[PDB]
Design a protein around this nucleic acid. Sequence first.
RNA 1: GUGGGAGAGGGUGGUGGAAUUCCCGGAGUAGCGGUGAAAUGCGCAGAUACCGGGAGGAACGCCGAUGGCGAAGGCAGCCACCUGGUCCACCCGUGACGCUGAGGCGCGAAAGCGUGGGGAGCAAACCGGAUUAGAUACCCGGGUAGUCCACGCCCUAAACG
RNA 2: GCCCGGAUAGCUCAGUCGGUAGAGCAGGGGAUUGAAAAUCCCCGUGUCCUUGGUUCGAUUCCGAGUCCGGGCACCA
RNA 3: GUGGUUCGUGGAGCCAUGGGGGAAUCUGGGCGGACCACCGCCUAAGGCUAAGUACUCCGGGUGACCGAUAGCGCACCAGUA
RNA 4: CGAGCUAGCCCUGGCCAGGGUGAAGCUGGGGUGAGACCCAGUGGAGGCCCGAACCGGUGGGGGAUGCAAACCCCUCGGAUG
RNA 5: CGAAUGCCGGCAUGAGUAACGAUAAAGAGGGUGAGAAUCCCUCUCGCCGUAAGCCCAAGGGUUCCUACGCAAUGGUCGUCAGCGUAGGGUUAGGCGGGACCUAAGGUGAAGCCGAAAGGCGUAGCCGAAGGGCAGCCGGUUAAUAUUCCGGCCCUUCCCGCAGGUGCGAUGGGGGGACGCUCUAGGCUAGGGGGACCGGAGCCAUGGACGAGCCCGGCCAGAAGCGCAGGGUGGGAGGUAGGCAAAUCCGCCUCCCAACAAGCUCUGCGUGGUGGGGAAGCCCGUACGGGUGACAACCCCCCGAAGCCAGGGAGCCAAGAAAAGCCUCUAAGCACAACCUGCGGGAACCCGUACCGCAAACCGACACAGGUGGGCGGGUGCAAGAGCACUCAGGCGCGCGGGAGAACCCUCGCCAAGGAACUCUGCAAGUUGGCCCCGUAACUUCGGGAGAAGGGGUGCUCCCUGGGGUGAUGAGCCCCGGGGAGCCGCAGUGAACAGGCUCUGGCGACUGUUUACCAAAAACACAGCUCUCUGCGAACUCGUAAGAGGAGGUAUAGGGAGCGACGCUUGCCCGGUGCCGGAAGGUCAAGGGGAGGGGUGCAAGCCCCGAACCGAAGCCCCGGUGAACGGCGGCCGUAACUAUAACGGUCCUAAGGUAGCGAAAUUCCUUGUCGGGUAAGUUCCGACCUGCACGAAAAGCGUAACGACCGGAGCGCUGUCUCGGCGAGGGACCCGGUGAAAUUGAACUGGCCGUGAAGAUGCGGCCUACCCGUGGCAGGACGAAAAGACCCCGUGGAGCUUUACUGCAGC
RNA 6: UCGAUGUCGGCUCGUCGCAUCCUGGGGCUGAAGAAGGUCCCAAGGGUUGGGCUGUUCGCCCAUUAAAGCGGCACGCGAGCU
Lengths: 272, 49
Amino acid sequence: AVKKFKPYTPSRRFMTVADFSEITKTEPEKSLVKPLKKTGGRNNQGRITVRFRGGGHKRLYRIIDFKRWDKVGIPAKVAAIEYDPNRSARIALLHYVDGEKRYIIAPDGLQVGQQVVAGPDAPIQVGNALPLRFIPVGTVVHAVELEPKKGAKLARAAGTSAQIQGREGDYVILRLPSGELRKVHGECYATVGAVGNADHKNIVLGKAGRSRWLGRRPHVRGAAMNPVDHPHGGGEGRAPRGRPPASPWGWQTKGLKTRKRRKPSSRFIIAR
Amino acid sequence: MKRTWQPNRRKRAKTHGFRARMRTPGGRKVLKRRRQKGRWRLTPAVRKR
RNA sequence: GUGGGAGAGGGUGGUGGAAUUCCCGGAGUAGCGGUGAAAUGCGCAGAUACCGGGAGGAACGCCGAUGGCGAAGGCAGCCACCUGGUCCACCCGUGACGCUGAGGCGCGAAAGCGUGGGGAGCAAACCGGAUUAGAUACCCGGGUAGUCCACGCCCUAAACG
RNA sequence: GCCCGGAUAGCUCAGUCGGUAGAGCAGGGGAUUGAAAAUCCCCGUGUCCUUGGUUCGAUUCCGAGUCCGGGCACCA
RNA sequence: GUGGUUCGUGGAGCCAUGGGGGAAUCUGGGCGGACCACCGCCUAAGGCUAAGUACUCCGGGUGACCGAUAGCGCACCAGUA
RNA sequence: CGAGCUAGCCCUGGCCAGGGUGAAGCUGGGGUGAGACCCAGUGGAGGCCCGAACCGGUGGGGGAUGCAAACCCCUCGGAUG
RNA sequence: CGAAUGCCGGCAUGAGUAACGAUAAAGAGGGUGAGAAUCCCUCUCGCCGUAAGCCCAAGGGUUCCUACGCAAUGGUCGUCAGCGUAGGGUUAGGCGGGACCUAAGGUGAAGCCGAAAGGCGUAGCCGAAGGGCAGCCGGUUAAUAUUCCGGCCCUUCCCGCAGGUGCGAUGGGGGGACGCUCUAGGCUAGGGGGACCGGAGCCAUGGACGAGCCCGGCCAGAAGCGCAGGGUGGGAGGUAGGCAAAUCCGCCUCCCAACAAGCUCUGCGUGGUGGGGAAGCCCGUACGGGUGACAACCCCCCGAAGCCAGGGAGCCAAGAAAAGCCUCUAAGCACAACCUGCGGGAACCCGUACCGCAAACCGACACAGGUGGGCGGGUGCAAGAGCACUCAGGCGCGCGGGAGAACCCUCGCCAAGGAACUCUGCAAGUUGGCCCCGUAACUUCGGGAGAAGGGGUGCUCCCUGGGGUGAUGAGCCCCGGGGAGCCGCAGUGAACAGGCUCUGGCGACUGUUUACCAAAAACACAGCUCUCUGCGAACUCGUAAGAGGAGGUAUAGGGAGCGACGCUUGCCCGGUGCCGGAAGGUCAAGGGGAGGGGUGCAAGCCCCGAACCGAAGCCCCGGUGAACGGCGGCCGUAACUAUAACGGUCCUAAGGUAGCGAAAUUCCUUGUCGGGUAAGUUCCGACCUGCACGAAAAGCGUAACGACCGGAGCGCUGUCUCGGCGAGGGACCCGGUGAAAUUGAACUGGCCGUGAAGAUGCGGCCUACCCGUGGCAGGACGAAAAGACCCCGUGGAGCUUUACUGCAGC
RNA sequence: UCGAUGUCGGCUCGUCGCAUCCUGGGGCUGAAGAAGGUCCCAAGGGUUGGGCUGUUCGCCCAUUAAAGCGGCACGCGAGCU
Ligand SMILES: [K+]
Ligand SMILES: [K+]
Ligand SMILES: [K+]
Ligand SMILES: [K+]
Ligand SMILES: [K+]
Ligand SMILES: [K+]
Ligand SMILES: [K+]
Ligand SMILES: [K+]
Ligand SMILES: [K+]
Ligand SMILES: [K+]
Ligand SMILES: [K+]
Ligand SMILES: [K+]
Ligand SMILES: [K+]
Ligand SMILES: [K+]
Ligand SMILES: [K+]
Ligand SMILES: [K+]
Ligand SMILES: [K+]
Ligand SMILES: [K+]
Ligand SMILES: [K+]
Ligand SMILES: [K+]
Ligand SMILES: [K+]
Ligand SMILES: [K+]
Ligand SMILES: [K+]
Ligand SMILES: [K+]
Ligand SMILES: [K+]
Ligand SMILES: [K+]
Ligand SMILES: [K+]
Ligand SMILES: [K+]
Ligand SMILES: [K+]
Ligand SMILES: [K+]
Ligand SMILES: [K+]
Ligand SMILES: [K+]
Ligand SMILES: [K+]
Ligand SMILES: [K+]
Ligand SMILES: [K+]
Ligand SMILES: [K+]
Ligand SMILES: [K+]
Ligand SMILES: [K+]
Ligand SMILES: [K+]
Ligand SMILES: [K+]
Ligand SMILES: [K+]
Ligand SMILES: [K+]
Ligand SMILES: [K+]
Ligand SMILES: [K+]
Ligand SMILES: [K+]
Ligand SMILES: [K+]
Ligand SMILES: [K+]
Ligand SMILES: [K+]
Ligand SMILES: [K+]
Ligand SMILES: [K+]
Ligand SMILES: [K+]
Ligand SMILES: [K+]
Ligand SMILES: [K+]
Ligand SMILES: [K+]
Ligand SMILES: [K+]
Ligand SMILES: [K+]
Ligand SMILES: [K+]
Ligand SMILES: [Mg+2]
Ligand SMILES: [Mg+2]
Ligand SMILES: [Mg+2]
Ligand SMILES: [Mg+2]
Ligand SMILES: [Mg+2]
Ligand SMILES: [Mg+2]
Ligand SMILES: [Mg+2]
Ligand SMILES: [Mg+2]
Ligand SMILES: [Mg+2]
Ligand SMILES: [Mg+2]
Ligand SMILES: [Mg+2]
Ligand SMILES: [Mg+2]
Ligand SMILES: [Mg+2]
Ligand SMILES: [Mg+2]
Ligand SMILES: [Mg+2]
Ligand SMILES: [Mg+2]
Ligand SMILES: [Mg+2]
Ligand SMILES: [Mg+2]
Ligand SMILES: [Mg+2]
Ligand SMILES: [Mg+2]
Ligand SMILES: [Mg+2]
Ligand SMILES: [Mg+2]
Ligand SMILES: [Mg+2]
Ligand SMILES: [Mg+2]
Ligand SMILES: [Mg+2]
Ligand SMILES: [Mg+2]
Ligand SMILES: [Mg+2]
Ligand SMILES: [Mg+2]
Ligand SMILES: [Mg+2]
Ligand SMILES: [Mg+2]
Ligand SMILES: [Mg+2]
Ligand SMILES: [Mg+2]
Ligand SMILES: [Mg+2]
Ligand SMILES: [Mg+2]
Ligand SMILES: [Mg+2]
Ligand SMILES: [Mg+2]
Ligand SMILES: [Mg+2]
Ligand SMILES: [Mg+2]
Ligand SMILES: [Mg+2]
Ligand SMILES: [Mg+2]
Ligand SMILES: [Mg+2]
Ligand SMILES: [Mg+2]
Ligand SMILES: [Mg+2]
Ligand SMILES: [Mg+2]
Ligand SMILES: [Mg+2]
Ligand SMILES: [Mg+2]
Ligand SMILES: [Mg+2]
Ligand SMILES: [Mg+2]
Ligand SMILES: [Mg+2]
Ligand SMILES: [Mg+2]
Ligand SMILES: [Mg+2]
Ligand SMILES: [Mg+2]
Ligand SMILES: [Mg+2]
Ligand SMILES: [Mg+2]
Ligand SMILES: [Mg+2]
Ligand SMILES: [Mg+2]
Ligand SMILES: [Mg+2]
Ligand SMILES: [Mg+2]
Ligand SMILES: [Mg+2]
Ligand SMILES: [Mg+2]
Ligand SMILES: [Mg+2]
Ligand SMILES: [Mg+2]
Ligand SMILES: [Mg+2]
Ligand SMILES: [Mg+2]
Ligand SMILES: [Mg+2]
Ligand SMILES: [Mg+2]
Ligand SMILES: [Mg+2]
Ligand SMILES: [Mg+2]
Ligand SMILES: [Mg+2]
Ligand SMILES: [Mg+2]
Ligand SMILES: [Mg+2]
Ligand SMILES: [Mg+2]
Ligand SMILES: [Mg+2]
Ligand SMILES: [Mg+2]
Ligand SMILES: [Mg+2]
Ligand SMILES: [Mg+2]
Ligand SMILES: [Mg+2]
Ligand SMILES: [Mg+2]
Ligand SMILES: [Mg+2]
Ligand SMILES: [Mg+2]
Ligand SMILES: [Mg+2]
Ligand SMILES: [Mg+2]
Ligand SMILES: [Mg+2]
Ligand SMILES: [Mg+2]
Ligand SMILES: [Mg+2]
Ligand SMILES: [Mg+2]
Ligand SMILES: [Mg+2]
Ligand SMILES: [Mg+2]
Ligand SMILES: [Mg+2]
Ligand SMILES: [Mg+2]
Ligand SMILES: [Mg+2]
Ligand SMILES: [Mg+2]
Ligand SMILES: [Mg+2]
Ligand SMILES: [Mg+2]
Ligand SMILES: [Mg+2]
Ligand SMILES: [Mg+2]
Ligand SMILES: [Mg+2]
Ligand SMILES: [Mg+2]
Ligand SMILES: [Mg+2]
Ligand SMILES: [Mg+2]
Ligand SMILES: [Mg+2]
Ligand SMILES: [Mg+2]
Ligand SMILES: [Mg+2]
Ligand SMILES: [Mg+2]
Ligand SMILES: [Mg+2]
Ligand SMILES: [Mg+2]
Ligand SMILES: [Mg+2]
Ligand SMILES: [Mg+2]
Ligand SMILES: [Mg+2]
Ligand SMILES: [Mg+2]
Ligand SMILES: [Mg+2]
Ligand SMILES: [Mg+2]
Ligand SMILES: [Mg+2]
Ligand SMILES: [Mg+2]
Ligand SMILES: [Mg+2]
Ligand SMILES: [Mg+2]
Ligand SMILES: [Mg+2]
Ligand SMILES: [Mg+2]
Ligand SMILES: [Mg+2]
Ligand SMILES: [Mg+2]
Ligand SMILES: [Mg+2]
Ligand SMILES: [Mg+2]
Ligand SMILES: [Mg+2]
Ligand SMILES: [Mg+2]
Ligand SMILES: [Mg+2]
Ligand SMILES: [Mg+2]
Ligand SMILES: [Mg+2]
Ligand SMILES: [Mg+2]
Ligand SMILES: [Mg+2]
Ligand SMILES: [Mg+2]
Ligand SMILES: [Mg+2]
Ligand SMILES: [Mg+2]
Ligand SMILES: [Mg+2]
Ligand SMILES: [Mg+2]
Ligand SMILES: [Mg+2]
Ligand SMILES: [Mg+2]
Ligand SMILES: [Mg+2]
Ligand SMILES: [Mg+2]
Ligand SMILES: [Mg+2]
Ligand SMILES: [Mg+2]
Ligand SMILES: [Mg+2]
Ligand SMILES: [Mg+2]
Ligand SMILES: [Mg+2]
Ligand SMILES: [Mg+2]
Ligand SMILES: [Mg+2]
Ligand SMILES: [Mg+2]
Ligand SMILES: [Mg+2]
Ligand SMILES: [Mg+2]
Ligand SMILES: [Mg+2]
Ligand SMILES: [Mg+2]
Ligand SMILES: [Mg+2]
Ligand SMILES: [Mg+2]
Ligand SMILES: [Mg+2]
Ligand SMILES: [Mg+2]
Ligand SMILES: [Mg+2]
Ligand SMILES: [Mg+2]
Ligand SMILES: [Mg+2]
Ligand SMILES: [Mg+2]
Ligand SMILES: [Mg+2]
Ligand SMILES: [Mg+2]
Ligand SMILES: [Mg+2]
Ligand SMILES: [Mg+2]
Ligand SMILES: [Mg+2]
Ligand SMILES: [Mg+2]
Ligand SMILES: [Mg+2]
Ligand SMILES: [Mg+2]
Ligand SMILES: [Mg+2]
Ligand SMILES: [Mg+2]
Ligand SMILES: [Mg+2]
């Protein structure tokens, strides 16, 4: 379900906006928002370390809960479902029965009203979070932790999910959004379900400006520069690549693998 | 056109000020030098009030 | 209307085992494939063949029929739910309400097409090996789209009785 | 105009350490067929482009010349 | 592995030391240009030590030094306008 | 030593006369088994249109020891992004 | 010292020359004074008026006011001045900032890093055109005024009274608190009108003594009262959350209440009282005073973009923080404290003049440039900040007088023709607004479209339908509709305001760029593919700490190419890249030491050192094309000829598929044919022999878009035949002021020759009295820049890579 | 001539040569006439307007008495483009 426009302007022909139906609250929960310092892609030296970043709508960080176990066994009521402009996924405002309000990243299905809770107990239901070991094999799950107590860091982007495939001692065999087969510790929490807002991948920004709203300044091809600037700089008209394609920093960029070989997590990966 | 000199009393002192010089060690030599030479003013003259 | 049937009729959601392929483990040695015969291919960097563990997809052996259902196209593992047509019995109810049907509207195999997803087997195109005078074919080794799902198109047929 | 390469059987081409040059196809004579083809058996003609030289001897080595093909003919 | 020394890897010792290994108290240890013997010379891994040496912001004395385009950038209210 | 010019980004403020066009959504009517859709009204979207401010700098003329070390006149581009 | 485009200084030439800095514009009378176009004053004239007026901010820093001055500064003049000399001038509890808050950022206890210097860094602190916070209207000075004075009104601190109540933090919680577009109600600012109120006066020139003309008819105001609107449920129980504790907030369950009310809060009207108060006329002011007056002070209409304001609706890109403030409890204290009234007292530092779209700021200048926010009246024109005029206000641009040439510039008209001009309709025309009618191919269905093309447009009288405000009524507004008629060459009568079409290329589009010769077909762009990247991600900056990535997590992030969209995107993996290969070769330090060597009388001590064990890399084996890349030759053959579907053979990793094709690519070439034209190197359609297209350095198309680039036509025209006239600003003459590059020195002619090969300068001849003014550009191989092309230099720089050697990195 | 001698074409303005394109005069003719041919004298004047291309050139359109060729730094950018 995605919004389209009639072509009453060039660039409305193809523009497409998310259907905002599952959205329930519109202003966010004040006691749960910080201002986020916008970098423009600049590091603590005043120096761009990520090109073509900046501008883009002013935003307000929603502090969201990626460690669910700091409230084991207290249920919560899904109070709202609202837009969070700091991620692709939509956040669920929930209301704990001891009165604490916290932000969850909303799974698919989860509707205003239901109960949610996290702990070893935790019925196997969408919204609930459990140490991985007590999650039925083959369940699809999201917001996984990579190591225990370090907080969810996996399958959080709109429509993502991992699948529990098997177990080996303290480690369960996970299939990540990227098809890769990782062992992950059992005491790693994970809330069950997939992430939802799955149509996300179907919006069509439509015009140069929509990119600009998202903090994305134009991106200029190596081809388009001169050789001071870039390996593909120069030539007379137009120039084939001329060499193994490369980055402004000169490294190969069609194939050249960069994950460090010696990396200790090598031991717990099995895929691609 | 718009020329290059666009006076700003705050910018002038933030940038060439005595305090500014004494922060960086390069600046303290800039002072060290203007003293050792006799310059009547070590830092540019500005005007807060 | 009332009571009943038979049924691979349709839609949905689940679920089972055989087999193929790939992966890991174990044990094992020089061939395995393939064909008319071959070659290409695969294999001591440990293949084929055998055991165990897993992953994934697609199709449902026996039952099975010259059988059944559907208007047609078509439909076949099993389970539930939702749902269409039909048949019989009984002779209760309406009372000619019937037949057909130009246009309209809906369904409509396969291939194809769009957006996603999926991808084990198979396989247009394509590549090799062969055969031939040539072989842009038939046979062989590989192989993409497609084949599968969802939504939306296309509307064809020896859509045949 | 400038430099590189090539020129061998009818056609397309290997090839040589200086001495007797081959491959496929075409062609020829036989066979098979009713007849052609495909198949099969047997058969090369070559003055190795022209010219001059090196040699005992040159298709083979050398210098030129035709001819063909390829690159170049830039600042102007 | 380097630096220092005349020593640019050279027969490359001596002094120093980032890395590794790692002792002994005089019958101990370092040195005399690889190394060995011999014969000598020294006493590592704690510290201090005037003077003789260098310099001229400052004061003075001199000049086969300048004399206002010279001499300091400045003889004058110049590191100023 | 410089980002008081210029380039980009960050924080916090401000600005854009007046006209046009009339998207979706609504609401009614039609339609149908239900729908799709159709028509009207409302509505007031847009790197939408005309045009000042403002931002520009197309073409032409002028200037060329200039008014001006890039200006002027006519003309033209954007003008809710 | 004679040369170094030498250095410093002086003074010449060009020269009384160019210039005197917007073509808004001047004239006179009077006055002052040694002296006046330039200063004062009056009268007339012109110019600005979304400014060329007025108010803040920044900058500048005495320029402000006055008196006395004119050497210089002023593009002339100067009696004047933004100049000289002196003297005066800037008043705040409420305006701005500070004894308040936080933002990015800066700084920075703790703590981390780094040879040194220093780099980072949670808290804290700093940091504002953001939050917060108490003054409005008049009057007065030569010059300040929300600052002084008047009237009216507030804030905070201290100390009292009285009355309240568990008080009490830097801790908890609420609030503060937030986008963009559209926007209702009710007001206010501001305006227009009045037959009404007030007012000096007026009756001209034919008429008018009129409900005539002219002028004005308000401003501030506490409490309370109204009219608008904002914000907010009330109670009770439970409680594990809000890093202690809460009675607060949060969550739960009860109840009453609920489109309100009530409580608050703000705006607006009113309101004690206070102020203002025209034109005109007379005052002597460079300008202010007197009077007008006991001024009046009312009604109606328009109406904000401002106010009520945290209002409402829609939308996606999802819209600061901290304090002040309210609540809550902790220690501590409750003979404290706080809250509420009302009283007295206390209330500091800094700024304040003037300029401020400009002669005071940035541009070396009294520079036609640049400079942020607010106000910016009236009438008309469909609207408006547009356009014309014009109010308040301000100005005529700090050289003038004449003249009436060329020529230049800006501008107006042109008979006939109408693009014949030319690289090109360059330029200039035409067209222009609003209303109505009407509008094609093609299309992505929105568009194309203002397509095209037409008709209308003023004024007068009669009829007449709606709105708004009043009241349903009058008046005042607004949107109209019908019919008669009038005058001109002309009714958007001035001013502002598209020329149109057809057909190609390129780019889809809006955007972006070479500040200052290129705005584009270039860049970007949604979108598509490839690839890396499992998170202490990859990548980027940094020696490091750290940081960006990202408070993100494969629907995400980096890199590369392609560039909406449609239909597509072929074959080649031999070489190069990348990917995969737990075997094999090779392979450095290391290990290991067969076996030698040097020395010692030996025990030793010290060197070499063969196997063999040794990684990555390379080789090797495979993969890989939206990875770098590549994508053939010759000969023959058909029953007229021609041509070759077909065959033969050499070579290759493989031999270019669809589409397209003399093209932004085609050399021959103006290819050939067809179309347009009387004529077409261009353009369009074709053909294919593609010198040397061809598929994501994408291929072929594509509606729409374009200050791109091309061909054509229609309209119109001084572009042209081919010029004429005219206006103004210069040029020219006179008065004032007065430069510049350049310059060996000059007494500086023509020809034919000669000369280092292009002579004022030599020869011969010929011409020629001395000196200027306006003009033109043939020559002084005229000026200007130590040629920018070319070469040279064992000169330099940017850039490339399978050049060398290295270093970072891996 | 590199301490600079601006370079094609167009425009404008010409001027000179004559080996003459026209006009004028002539000899010869395979000159009946008329029209030509060829060569001689002659430089006084004349020598068009368009399409195409930056073009010079050239080719074409329509004319004409004719539609001359060369030089002057392939005349002329302190004259323009
Ligand atoms: K790009
Ligand atoms: K390029
Ligand atoms: K056969
Ligand atoms: K197969
Ligand atoms: K496949
Ligand atoms: K059938
Ligand atoms: K059948
Ligand atoms: K060969
Ligand atoms: K042969
Ligand atoms: K040494
Ligand atoms: K030692
Ligand atoms: K020694
Ligand atoms: K010694
Ligand atoms: K000492
Ligand atoms: K002197
Ligand atoms: K000096
Ligand atoms: K509508
Ligand atoms: K609109
Ligand atoms: K000199
Ligand atoms: K002079
Ligand atoms: K003037
Ligand atoms: K006005
Ligand atoms: K003077
Ligand atoms: K001046
Ligand atoms: K005087
Ligand atoms: K502030
Ligand atoms: K508090
Ligand atoms: K708070
Ligand atoms: K008023
Ligand atoms: K003041
Ligand atoms: K004159
Ligand atoms: K012409
Ligand atoms: K009325
Ligand atoms: K217009
Ligand atoms: K395209
Ligand atoms: K520049
Ligand atoms: K443009
Ligand atoms: K560009
Ligand atoms: K972050
Ligand atoms: K290849
Ligand atoms: K390869
Ligand atoms: K390969
Ligand atoms: K062609
Ligand atoms: K080509
Ligand atoms: K033609
Ligand atoms: K353009
Ligand atoms: K001249
Ligand atoms: K050399
Ligand atoms: K010269
Ligand atoms: K030269
Ligand atoms: K003649
Ligand atoms: K003549
Ligand atoms: K030509
Ligand atoms: K020349
Ligand atoms: K010129
Ligand atoms: K020229
Ligand atoms: K000249
Ligand atoms: Mg907050
Ligand atoms: Mg810094
Ligand atoms: Mg470029
Ligand atoms: Mg750079
Ligand atoms: Mg490079
Ligand atoms: Mg390149
Ligand atoms: Mg370039
Ligand atoms: Mg190229
Ligand atoms: Mg990967
Ligand atoms: Mg300057
Ligand atoms: Mg001093
Ligand atoms: Mg059934
Ligand atoms: Mg079924
Ligand atoms: Mg195995
Ligand atoms: Mg049934
Ligand atoms: Mg009956
Ligand atoms: Mg009956
Ligand atoms: Mg079908
Ligand atoms: Mg199908
Ligand atoms: Mg698919
Ligand atoms: Mg041959
Ligand atoms: Mg011979
Ligand atoms: Mg050394
Ligand atoms: Mg050496
Ligand atoms: Mg030693
Ligand atoms: Mg020794
Ligand atoms: Mg010795
Ligand atoms: Mg003396
Ligand atoms: Mg001196
Ligand atoms: Mg002297
Ligand atoms: Mg001096
Ligand atoms: Mg700046
Ligand atoms: Mg900046
Ligand atoms: Mg726009
Ligand atoms: Mg404004
Ligand atoms: Mg401005
Ligand atoms: Mg500007
Ligand atoms: Mg311009
Ligand atoms: Mg010009
Ligand atoms: Mg404009
Ligand atoms: Mg516009
Ligand atoms: Mg914006
Ligand atoms: Mg001299
Ligand atoms: Mg002097
Ligand atoms: Mg002097
Ligand atoms: Mg002169
Ligand atoms: Mg003159
Ligand atoms: Mg003059
Ligand atoms: Mg006068
Ligand atoms: Mg006078
Ligand atoms: Mg005026
Ligand atoms: Mg105006
Ligand atoms: Mg003014
Ligand atoms: Mg100031
Ligand atoms: Mg100044
Ligand atoms: Mg003054
Ligand atoms: Mg003077
Ligand atoms: Mg003055
Ligand atoms: Mg003065
Ligand atoms: Mg204050
Ligand atoms: Mg104090
Ligand atoms: Mg603070
Ligand atoms: Mg710091
Ligand atoms: Mg403030
Ligand atoms: Mg204040
Ligand atoms: Mg006053
Ligand atoms: Mg004043
Ligand atoms: Mg006042
Ligand atoms: Mg309390
Ligand atoms: Mg309103
Ligand atoms: Mg008022
Ligand atoms: Mg009005
Ligand atoms: Mg009035
Ligand atoms: Mg009276
Ligand atoms: Mg009279
Ligand atoms: Mg009267
Ligand atoms: Mg009267
Ligand atoms: Mg009032
Ligand atoms: Mg009031
Ligand atoms: Mg309540
Ligand atoms: Mg309680
Ligand atoms: Mg607590
Ligand atoms: Mg209320
Ligand atoms: Mg009085
Ligand atoms: Mg609101
Ligand atoms: Mg604070
Ligand atoms: Mg003031
Ligand atoms: Mg002024
Ligand atoms: Mg002012
Ligand atoms: Mg202003
Ligand atoms: Mg002024
Ligand atoms: Mg002024
Ligand atoms: Mg002014
Ligand atoms: Mg002036
Ligand atoms: Mg100015
Ligand atoms: Mg100035
Ligand atoms: Mg105005
Ligand atoms: Mg107004
Ligand atoms: Mg107006
Ligand atoms: Mg108008
Ligand atoms: Mg006036
Ligand atoms: Mg002016
Ligand atoms: Mg003037
Ligand atoms: Mg005319
Ligand atoms: Mg005419
Ligand atoms: Mg005409
Ligand atoms: Mg023409
Ligand atoms: Mg034009
Ligand atoms: Mg007009
Ligand atoms: Mg048409
Ligand atoms: Mg339309
Ligand atoms: Mg129209
Ligand atoms: Mg029209
Ligand atoms: Mg009329
Ligand atoms: Mg009239
Ligand atoms: Mg073309
Ligand atoms: Mg474009
Ligand atoms: Mg536009
Ligand atoms: Mg554009
Ligand atoms: Mg430029
Ligand atoms: Mg440039
Ligand atoms: Mg620009
Ligand atoms: Mg430049
Ligand atoms: Mg230009
Ligand atoms: Mg330009
Ligand atoms: Mg980090
Ligand atoms: Mg990306
Ligand atoms: Mg990217
Ligand atoms: Mg591109
Ligand atoms: Mg490898
Ligand atoms: Mg090995
Ligand atoms: Mg070794
Ligand atoms: Mg060893
Ligand atoms: Mg290796
Ligand atoms: Mg290989
Ligand atoms: Mg390709
Ligand atoms: Mg033609
Ligand atoms: Mg042309
Ligand atoms: Mg290409
Ligand atoms: Mg390609
Ligand atoms: Mg392209
Ligand atoms: Mg094309
Ligand atoms: Mg197109
Ligand atoms: Mg003319
Ligand atoms: Mg004239
Ligand atoms: Mg005139
Ligand atoms: Mg003169
Ligand atoms: Mg004069
Ligand atoms: Mg000179
Ligand atoms: Mg001569
Ligand atoms: Mg002589
Ligand atoms: Mg002579
Ligand atoms: Mg003269
Ligand atoms: Mg010259
Ligand atoms: Mg030179
Ligand atoms: Mg030069
Ligand atoms: Mg240059
Ligand atoms: Mg060199
Ligand atoms: Mg060199
Ligand atoms: Mg010279
Ligand atoms: Mg002659
Ligand atoms: Mg005759
Ligand atoms: Mg002549
Ligand atoms: Mg002549
Ligand atoms: Mg002609
Ligand atoms: Mg020549
Ligand atoms: Mg010549
Ligand atoms: Mg020439
Ligand atoms: Mg000339």
